[PDB]
Design a protein around this ligand. Sequence first.
Ligand code: SAM
Ligand code: SAM
Lengths: 387, 387
Amino acid sequence: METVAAIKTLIQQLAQSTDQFGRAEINDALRELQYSLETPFDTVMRMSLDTCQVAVARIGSDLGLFKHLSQCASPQSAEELADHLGCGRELMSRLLRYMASVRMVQQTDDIKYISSNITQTLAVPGLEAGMRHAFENLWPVLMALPDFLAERKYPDIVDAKDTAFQKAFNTDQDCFHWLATQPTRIANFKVLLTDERTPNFLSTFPLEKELGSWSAEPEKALFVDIGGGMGHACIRLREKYPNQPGRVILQDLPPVLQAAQATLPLSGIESMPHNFHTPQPVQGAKFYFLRLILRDFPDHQALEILQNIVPAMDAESRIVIDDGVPPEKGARWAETGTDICIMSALGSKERTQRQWEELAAKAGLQLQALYQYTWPVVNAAMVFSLQ
Amino acid sequence: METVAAIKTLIQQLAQSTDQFGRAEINDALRELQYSLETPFDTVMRMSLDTCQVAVARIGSDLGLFKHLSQCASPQSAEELADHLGCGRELMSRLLRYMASVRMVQQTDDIKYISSNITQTLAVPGLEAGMRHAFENLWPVLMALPDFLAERKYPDIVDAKDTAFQKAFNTDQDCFHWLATQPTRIANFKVLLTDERTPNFLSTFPLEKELGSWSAEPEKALFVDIGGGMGHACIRLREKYPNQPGRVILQDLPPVLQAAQATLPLSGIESMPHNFHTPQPVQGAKFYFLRLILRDFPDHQALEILQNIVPAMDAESRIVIDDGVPPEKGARWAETGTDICIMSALGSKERTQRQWEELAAKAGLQLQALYQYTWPVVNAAMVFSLQ
Ligand SMILES: C[S@@+](CC[C@H](N)C(=O)[O-])C[C@H]1O[C@@H](n2cnc3c(N)ncnc32)[C@H](O)[C@@H]1O
Ligand SMILES: C[S@@+](CC[C@H](N)C(=O)[O-])C[C@H]1O[C@@H](n2cnc3c(N)ncnc32)[C@H](O)[C@@H]1O
């Protein structure tokens, strides 16, 4: 119908007319409209069949389909793709037909296949690794969660060693300890670390305002990236603020620091092995930065991580928690799904602003400023000082 | 956004003005817009988190939350629902926040909870049973598919006894034989059978024109519903054509005929126990009807089912296959996802019109007429005669 074609045109034109945050708001609206207008049968069909996407993405990734199609200059037949990738012809035709129906590839008028936006995404190593993590790590924990909760008469989960994870992978270890003994998972996790989220806190963080008159003299630390992974925050800080003095220090475990060396600048960023369960060695830094760290820990462990930093602080030192700050009400699926997943796997939780302030108060900290940098799903740099 | 409220108003007004087929077209367009507009990170988040929906629906079902909320007259607090249903209060608060974010319930401005469209759907026994089936039968088979295809170097799956199912449930039994040994699963399937799809073939089936001069004496059957389940097709036939002569006969296995009795009219429809893997007892029927039967069998078994019927047929007899008829190209997610699920669990497949005609020719049948009754996902009554 011309009506459907016109709806598509108007929504694309409105999407192009706004920014990434406007487009995120439109996408959530489109989802809310689908759910509101689907029939009861459609609801069950959707819940039944949308689980297919991750499995079929896992297969495409195993075959190298997404990478191959992303490099192809012309439409490919199912036959050409099957013979090239070493797949049964009929299986490849069925997988491609399914993939086209969910835009994981596109199907042409003459029943050939080209890259979509999603083909290209699943071709990117860091994003492919996310999809692989969802299949091998998240799926099993969600599959265990209902019977786990039933067996245990619906407990409030508060312990990383007593959640669905232990049922899912038949172990008494917490997720973090268990992953160390699984080379396949560590390799994928290693690739997942290379994905850099955009935008980042530096888009809205008023660094010069937050600095005040803080002196890098004689030899003080500007920024200590605690569990900084590949040190994207350190790299982006040095890139945005090349003239601000002070040590910029990436802190992580030796294997992650080794992985980071390749892509770290040759000067200006220190690689310091540090376990964030031990006292913070760098004294009187301006910013102690924790990005997507504390959300992976229940309150007891998150508190201990903060308590390990507080004694290193000057009056001018700030702890900067860069993490999810879902609202009190009307939280979006991306903030609320993450909460169920980290409950199931890690025994942890998403925290509202009030819950972040209650946690930080136990560590003797007070919130000075909160700088949101994503919308409508809230990620913010929360700036904490000594009480 | 005023923009988002405006899009919702426009789509809702266009949705209300069209019919169910028009709303299904709009819904498919909103999905495609969503995928096309998505960022690479959104794609991975969606694939990571959308499978939460089934796990959380299953937990809500276990707690009886959806039936409870559907019968509440006023908005309920998380604490009221947790206390009433026997759930940890923090667990219940988090589940409800997640459910509200995906419209499985509605959250009020007061942070209390009411029934949405989806909470009513998940309270309907037949539809709840569809969601439990997705969780306990489909999820494990989709979980097994990628590694099963990898280990076996991407075979064309062709055998019910050799597909993802056997790896998922650690068995050499086919799905149908295995399910029959599992009481809780058998019980869920019987509730699943109580769901009647709408619309149905009688909306576009020109019965009078197909009958022509056909006569019901001596004691001939107008309609034999082979695997008719609750016998909804028999009920609708007798409701729509109450004065058309000829016996109307529900065929299924004894336990399903037993379950059908309470819903069946007192006269006009015979309950005849009959295994459709055995020779058809009713001779010279006008219509031998197979609704959503053959798609659950690979060609070899589907052919055996048809070959059990053909010897009972007159020149006036028709086999009516009422089933999915996906197009040669541009097939929708609801008819390609089904294909991947039935490949994985049953070793079967969706069939294009031409694939149905090829199968039916091997049984000595030729397509007389094809009567579509759903759009844009094709279900049709295909009328076959002896060739
Ligand atoms: C979500 S990942 C990367 C987060 C990083 N801040 C970012 O935003 O790119 C969490 C990081 O914590 C690190 N990590 C885990 N346990 C740690 C520990 N005990 N001490 C220090 N780093 C740790 C991991 O190696 C990983 O790089
Ligand atoms: C998809 S379900 C119901 C389909 C039904 N025609 C309808 O549209 O409602 C398949 C039906 O086949 C029945 N069935 C399964 N195996 C059977 C067999 N060997 N003989 C007869 N009926 C069988 C089941 O009991 C069930 O009612």
